[PDB]
Design a protein around this ligand. Structure first.
Ligand code: CA
Ligand code: CA
Length: 258
DNA sequence: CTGTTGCGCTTGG
DNA sequence: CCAAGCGCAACAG
């Protein structure tokens, strides 16, 4: 299953097991965490799949100063663990200056990465995580390191897409006719008898993507920003103790009972 | 209103 | 195992 379905399967599990007190926030909605417990003591729960990514922050390479700078447009403030990572990379600047989509892993200890994740998700009022290994496993944020192995890398991650708008349809129609294919466009609703799902066309300093949602096709404009962010990757540990899973399951049942 | 940018998400190969 | 970006919201121009 995908992550969208996985978040639903978690909250449908929580609602059936503990009552209808778990609201899911928007999918791809990033302003807050996934699941909101609407009890007397309300808190958030974050659903991760066994192989997930776990937060990021962009660093701008100051090639003139040979140091790395925190992007002022980041959405989380610098914590002592952010400055630790930045201090390492700027000590090894030239080895990290060659930005790449493949990225360079950061060989600092895993404890520092756990701490950054702990502080990032505490700022989001996350009290517990939920994930499955065949059955659902739930634990509070303070026991994170006992469930996930954390790697950290510095890689380019191209920014996301936007809807095609009124201004850029002329460039998109011109790029589609140069491709030589059926179509008819009513407004921005694109119709065609040929399957053009996930087709990518280019032109006029813009790359477009075509997707079907409601029987017809709509168009996305791909980004042009290619910045580099420190980003974390987590993997669920295979053999986990059972004294720990029950101890943190009861901490969860005690938290939704306040 | 347009377009950058950062953050969500594993996903694709 | 290794490489890599689109779907979102916030925000300056
Ligand atoms: Ca989320
Ligand atoms: Ca999540």
């Amino acid at each position: 299953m995908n992550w969208k379905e996985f978040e639903v399967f978690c909250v449908t599990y929580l609602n059936k097991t503990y009552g209808n007190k778990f609201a899911k926030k928007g999918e791809s909605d990033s302003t807050t965490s996934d699941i909101l417990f609407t009890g007397n003591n309300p808190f958030y729960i974050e659903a991760k799949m066994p192989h997930s990514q776990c937060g990021q922050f962009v660093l701008i390479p100051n090639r003139a100063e040979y140091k790395f700078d925190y992007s002022p447009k980041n959405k989380s403030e610098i914590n002592p663990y952010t400055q630790k990572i930045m201090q390492f990379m700027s000590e090894n600047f030239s080895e990290y200056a060659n930005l790449s989509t493949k990225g360079k892993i950061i060989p600092l200890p895993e404890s520092v990465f756990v701490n950054w994740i702990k502080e990032y998700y505490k700022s989001k009022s996350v009290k517990f995580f939920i994930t499955s290994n065949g059955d659902f496993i739930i634990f509070p944020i303070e026991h994170f390191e006992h469930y996930f192995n954390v790697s950290c890398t510095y890689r380019i991650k191209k920014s996301g897409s936007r809807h095609l708008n009124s201004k850029s349809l002329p460039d998109f129609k011109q790029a589609l006719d140069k491709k030589g294919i059926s179509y008819t466009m009513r407004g921005l609703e694109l119709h065609s008898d040929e399957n053009i799902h996930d087709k990518r066309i280019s032109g006029d300093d813009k790359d477009f993507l075509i997707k079907e949602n409601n029987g017809a096709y709509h168009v996305k404009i791909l980004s042009n920003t290619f910045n580099a962010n420190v980003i974390f990757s987590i993997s669920l540990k295979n053999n986990i103790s059972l004294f720990i899973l029950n101890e943190d399951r009861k901490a969860f049942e005690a938290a939704i009972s306040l």
